[PDB]
Amino acid sequence: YTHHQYIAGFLMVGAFAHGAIFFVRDYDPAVNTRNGEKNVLARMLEHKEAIISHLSWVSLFLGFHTLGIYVHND
Amino acid sequence: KLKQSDFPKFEGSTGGWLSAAKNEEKYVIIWTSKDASLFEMPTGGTAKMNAGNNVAYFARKEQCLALGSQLRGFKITNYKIFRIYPPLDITLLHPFDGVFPEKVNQGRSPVGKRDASIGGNPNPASLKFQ
Amino acid sequence: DIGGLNPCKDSEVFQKRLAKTVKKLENRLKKYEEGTPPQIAIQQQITQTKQRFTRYADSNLLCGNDGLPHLITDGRWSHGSEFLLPSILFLYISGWIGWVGRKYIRTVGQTSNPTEKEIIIDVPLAISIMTSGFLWPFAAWQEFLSGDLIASDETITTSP
Amino acid sequence: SHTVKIYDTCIGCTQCVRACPTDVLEMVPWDGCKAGQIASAPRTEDCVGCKRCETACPTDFLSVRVYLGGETTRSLGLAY
Amino acid sequence: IQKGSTVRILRKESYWYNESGTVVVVDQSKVRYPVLVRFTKVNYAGTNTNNFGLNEVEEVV
Amino acid sequence: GDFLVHHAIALGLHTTTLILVKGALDARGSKLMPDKKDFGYSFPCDGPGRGGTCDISAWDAFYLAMFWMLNTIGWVTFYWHWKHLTLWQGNQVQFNESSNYIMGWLRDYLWLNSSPLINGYNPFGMNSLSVWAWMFLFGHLVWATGFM
Amino acid sequence: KSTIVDFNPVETSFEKWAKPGQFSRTLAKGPKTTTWIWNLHADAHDFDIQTNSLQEVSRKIFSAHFGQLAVIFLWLSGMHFHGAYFSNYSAWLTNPTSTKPSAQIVWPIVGQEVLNADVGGNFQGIQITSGFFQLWRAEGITSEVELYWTAVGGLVASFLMLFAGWFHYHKAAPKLEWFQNVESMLNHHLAGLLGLGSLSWAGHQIHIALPINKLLDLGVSPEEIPLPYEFILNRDLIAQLYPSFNKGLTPFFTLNWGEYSDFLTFKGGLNPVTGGLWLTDTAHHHLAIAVLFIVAGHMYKTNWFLGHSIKTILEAHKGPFTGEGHKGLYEVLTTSWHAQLAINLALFGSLSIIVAHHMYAMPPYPYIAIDYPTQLSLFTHHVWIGGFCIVGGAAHGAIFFVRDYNAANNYNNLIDRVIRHRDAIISHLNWVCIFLGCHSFGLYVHNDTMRALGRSQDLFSDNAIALKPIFAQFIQNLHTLAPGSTAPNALTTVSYAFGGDVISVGSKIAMMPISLGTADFLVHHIHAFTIHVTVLILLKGVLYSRNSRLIPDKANLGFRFPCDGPGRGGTCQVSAWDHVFLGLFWMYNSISIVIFHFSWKMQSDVWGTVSPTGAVSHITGGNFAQSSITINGWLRDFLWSQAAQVVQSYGSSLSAYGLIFLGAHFIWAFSLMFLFSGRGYWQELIESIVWAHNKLKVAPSIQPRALSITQGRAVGVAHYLLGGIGTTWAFFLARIISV
Ligand code: CLA
Ligand code: CLA
Ligand code: CLA
Ligand code: CLA
Ligand code: CLA
Ligand SMILES: CC1=C(/C=C/C(C)=C/C=C/C(C)=C/C=C/C=C(C)/C=C/C=C(C)/C=C/C2=C(C)CCCC2(C)C)C(C)(C)CCC1
């Protein structure tokens, strides 16, 4: 179980790292855009601030309250 | 006491040049001073200028330029930096056209100038396999 | 009952916990003398422990196999005083705080020195705004309707 | 050696040239700004990559850009 | 646009992109970026002003 | 205890996803570096200018998210191993009671079950678990060299 | 129009209180980003950049010293007030060996009243490990009324120091020439402060502490002991305990000082009743110290044709190997506050560590050697303070080199010659550090791998390859033979740690010969190695603070800067501040190892109980000798074994120690976020958070910026130190209070 979960975490981090690499060196905005309008992938860079802000909110929410309940029990 | 009479009155520091500035390249800075002012070496400690011709050798261009920038505080401006290859291959470096790089001089052509802002740079995906 | 739990009023392990805590407190009480402040403090501890256990027993609280009150937060109003009512209370208080902060930011944002009024608070205006947050649910659903709650495209965006 | 590029947003304020520790940048005549001068990078072989040049740039997103590349004993700042 | 006018920055690589600034002076010479705009928010370098081109600023009504 | 540890797992997943998604989307540029795509996926920084640009590349986002992945997998594996140690030993009441607070974890999982491991070799003898104690100390040493 | 002070220099006004950052030229314009807030506190006490005049900096420093002394006096007044009102000091006086000192009671809220422990004497509260009860007993304080009056005096003194600071900044500020009278200052601090303080304390001991403590040790209850003033008005209450006061001061003025041998003794060892040093020995010590310091205060020429000039002394100490010698050092130390701070802080931390050693080595207070929590806490606290102060001295030496160092004024002197060969110093210190670390730690690892491989005869142990600290054992033998041979007027060795008998008070060991074997050899060399590496980091920071081969103009970047850029392969942390940051880390490492060695060695081979027949049983049982030679031994028999009390403290009166244990772990792990990450990621995340705020029209006018690189490092190191030191604090306190 430990081996497979560690391999799983490694693979997930690698998937996201290679997505970032694709953004840096393989992504072409012209291909993902037709007459100003952007396709499903190019639109992920338009509300990127919304995505990051809501990920930050969820992380802060869960961390604050999980740690709060754990420390309350402590 | 010293090899040359124009050397600054420096007692020598274990921060000077090494075997690199005997087989790759060494840098020499020359300047003329009105007073035997006491200045700080870019490598070690305090040295004394000569009331006249002064010549110093360093291992890096940056060390010579730091010394020259210090010299400007002494109202010294005529300092000139040269690059010496393993043999006596002297090349004037810092006052390249006799005018400091901060002052515009005619006869200089723009090198590395792009006729657009940063936003005009090409997309990296279009610069693949060249 | 819910999730296999049982009421704490009929949980034997709950009463065992109460008895053990009281016994420990009384054993501690035995090593002091007369009506001295230490004995008074330990007696107050015993009384508070008994009161807390009695209140938890008579509180519609479900206890597990460890004799500890478990919270039923699936949403049912039967156990509504465990999560739902505190949830509403916190939502009210936190919305109050956020609303008064946002109102103060937007109010001193239209003055000559907006940054000065953030390290040196305008206490009169701050007090004026803070006591006005009791209507934050109504104020929020009166500014969202007028379009004054959300910016549209003056917000800045990165290069891609 | 590192690569240094100058962009026409240059206002010719000379702060990049007087901040270079290795005499890489210089001011050259130009007609695209009020000062009539633009920075140039004719001695990038001495560029060390310290990026003091673009720390002194007042233009919005820079007019001098340093792209780190192949390393050399001059660019690595090796006194040995 | 003129001195005191309010413009929106259209330059993408700008700390004030999509934001509004105040025009300090529009140069009448043949410079590439004549419009000088002053902003209330300092950028990451601490400056609060920048020169923009004529096609990189849009006047606010 | 399962509820709380599942929420901890959710927090770990969300934070690792936040770091990785932020690095992926901000890979092509941001306000601090609107030309980050011109510098590639992995570069050290953009210099001390503009307030400081440490760990600004997309590679640095991977680098930071590796710690959070390790932490999240550690939480998951700690939860699994403690639950199954209590299940196999029979004292499932130990987990159900002590897993709700942090000191319960520290005392009853780590401190409690580390006793056989550290006594893989003592000033009196050694066991077949001696290699595991050596690997324990080796892992601590490599961890702290990473800290270096 | 006095020649030493300026009258009414600064007006007492509240106007500048309402203008934050008024001191700084850059911060006075007001905040534009959140970096301004952090810069406000980082430059508050940097008086060098607030004024261009040394006089103004000196006056600010003088008033800040007064404020600090007022704070210290308030803290002492609080301690005495707690002893008077919220303590069991009276009960502890009647039963020092069975009552645990407590001077802080906890209010009954949120169930926290469990922290009120059973300290004894019909009292509930937190056990005190600062040793105030023993100090007060040594002072002769036998009533809580005296503690109350000392607290009142402390409050009055704190107000007086506050008024003095205000007066000397706003009403009469001294001039630069007054501050630069280092000869007069040294004369006064040596004679008046030190010598007259020792003399006054010797007088107090002789007239108050000597009789009261002698009566206390005789079994007289504190209620029937006469009030301290009665020992002065009546020469018969003190002449019964010490039958030499009957002669008055005539033996003193007639040079017949032998008559005062009743209360001015030279005994050594410890009092068998209390386990502390003989208070007669302490009084004689303070008298001798007073005379020596008063004599030493008449050395420097101040206002007459008499004494020394420090300038003439330094300038005469040249040599063939040192060029101009100490010429210019007087100008350095009279024109730079940072150099004085460097010297004073380094020697002050070293003095604190020496104090920590001599404390447990020779317990100076009654019933303090048998209070193991007090001894452990005092040692650890003083060693921590010493390490911090030493790192601060190194930091301010680097600051002086960056800011106040003048190359022209230091031509060919000691400072110049040190910089001229900094390479040699740093390279040889690097080699020494590698040698010491390789050896000490690799001997530890060799022991660990030999034990793991089942080869017990290949270890670096006593029953194996043995590394006997023969030099230290020789010194131990020399001290135990000193009374009667080299100290012929001594009756007992200075400390029983060097050898002698086991001293026990109430069946608890006070002091005992500390045997040194191969285990002490390894840990002592570990101490030497860690100290050498810390010195390496700090000395590299000081010497390379102005220039280097990387950055020939590092002095132009200041003392505190993050880098010079990603060029030259990367120029992170080249500052001198970034060396005080790494040196802080290594000081934490060294001091942690030192306190671990002390705790384990004392618990295993000094502390314990003595059976009525004379059998010594220790707290752990002598496991230090054989199990402190491997890292697995330290992990298991010390950390894992003695952490049992901390983890099992829940539900007991020590539960606060477990909570602080967990919280310190949390803070230490929190530090690694700042230590491992970088500013760009956090700035770009704040970008999206700011986008959300702007979308909801709640973006603050003060633009939020991620902490600067230097501030990120400072936050990381501060959190790391707090977490580690707090974890060790909770561990030590819970372990040593439980057992
Ligand atoms: C099948 C999966 C797969 C594939 C095909 C690739 C392929 C690639 N990756 Mg990638 N990656 C993967 C999984 C994968 N990765 C995962 C799972 C992660 C997350 C950890 C990453 C994270 C990652 C990053 C962050 C980067 C790449 C990069 C690259 C490219 C260059 C690789 C390189 O230079 O290697 C270099 C190989 C090494 C440096 C060897 C490292 C060996 C490590 C340290 C382990 C060795 C220690 C070993 C355990 C010793 C034991 C100790 C003992 C005491 C017990 C290449 C296209 C790079 C790139 O530029 O892409 C364009 C880049 O920057 N990848
Ligand atoms: C008081 C005004 C205020 C308001 C209305 C908001 C509103 C918001 N913040 Mg926010 N924030 C504030 C202050 C405020 N914040 C401050 C002072 C900080 C610095 C610690 C932050 C740091 C912060 C982060 C890091 C994040 C948010 C996020 C968010 C959004 C989701 C809610 C959330 O996660 O709460 C977050 C709330 C906190 C972390 C605690 C705030 C600290 C106190 C309680 C607020 C200050 C009170 C103030 C002093 C009152 C003075 C007013 C008075 C003078 C009249 C939402 C737009 C998240 C987001 O973007 O999601 C979309 C997110 O990731 N905020
Ligand atoms: C015998 C005379 C004498 C005495 C006792 C002291 C004592 C002290 N001086 Mg001092 N000083 C003296 C002469 C003296 N000085 C002279 C002649 C000069 C001129 C060169 C200075 C210049 C000087 C400076 C520049 C500084 C000191 C500081 C200090 C303090 C060091 C902190 C310490 O050890 O805490 C021990 C603390 C105590 C024992 C508390 C009780 C001490 C009280 C306040 C008695 C102080 C005696 C005072 C000089 C009497 C003047 C009264 C006034 C009405 C005239 C200490 C209180 C430093 C300090 O902390 O500043 C405040 C500091 O920065 N002194
Ligand atoms: C006699 C002691 C003494 C004195 C007078 C000074 C004085 C000075 N130091 Mg200094 N220093 C000292 C000891 C001292 N230091 C020690 C022991 C160290 C080693 C750690 C240092 C390390 C140091 C560095 C690295 C730097 C200074 C700097 C400075 C200057 C500016 C200080 C400032 O504005 O801070 C204002 C005060 C603060 C910012 C307070 C910060 C809060 C601290 C860090 C946390 C304390 C936590 C506390 C223990 C409570 C935690 C409990 C928790 C549960 C809450 C000033 C001349 C700086 C400078 O530029 O010098 C010219 C600088 O860069 N010092
Ligand atoms: C456990 C983690 C760890 C370890 C092992 C070290 C080790 C060391 N640090 Mg440190 N350091 C650490 C954490 C650690 N650090 C952290 C967390 C920080 C952050 C603040 C630092 C910051 C720091 C600074 C700032 C400095 C050091 C320095 C040193 C060196 C001192 C000289 C020495 O003893 O070398 C000897 C090496 C050892 C003792 C390591 C073990 C070697 C074994 C026992 C012997 C040889 C084994 C053999 C060769 C194996 C061969 C087989 C193999 C090929 C398979 C040494 C390499 C100093 C330095 O550069 O050196 C002078 C220095 O200036 N460190
Ligand atoms: C409950 C249930 C169910 C359902 C289930 C489901 C529906 C699931 C789903 C799941 C899912 C749905 C999952 C997902 C996941 C995802 C992920 C994991 C992702 C990741 C991503 C990434 C990694 C990305 C990457 C990238 C980038 C970053 C950009 C560029 C491109 C790419 C793509 C590369 C059923 C009915 C069957 C039955 C049982 C019950």
Ligand SMILES: CC1=C(/C=C/C(C)=C/C=C/C(C)=C/C=C/C=C(C)/C=C/C=C(C)/C=C/C2=C(C)CCCC2(C)C)C(C)(C)CCC1
């Ligand atoms: C505890 C404490 C306190 C208190 C303190 C005190 C109480 C002190 C005292 C002190 C004192 C009370 C001191 C005294 C001193 C004195 C002296 C120091 C004297 C001297 C004298 C002399 C020196 C003389 C000499 C001579 C002459 C000149 C002539 C004749 C001969 C002869 C020789 C005799 C307080 C509250 C603050 C705070 C807290 C802590």
Ligand SMILES: CC1=C(C/C=C(\C)CCC[C@H](C)CCC[C@H](C)CCCC(C)C)C(=O)c2ccccc2C1=O
């Ligand atoms: C998280 C983080 C930030 C962001 C951190 C910020 C913006 C600090 C925010 C502090 C808040 C706003 C105030 C403090 C709030 C605390 C609750 C108060 C402290 C607790 C008291 C008990 C002392 C950096 O700027 C940074 C820079 C360089 C390296 C690493 C990092 C880094 O890890």
Ligand code: SF4
């Ligand atoms: S890096 Fe920037 S500063 Fe250093 S040389 Fe090249 S250009 Fe001049």
Ligand code: SF4
């Ligand atoms: S930012 Fe971090 S890495 Fe980039 S230069 Fe400054 S310090 Fe070196």
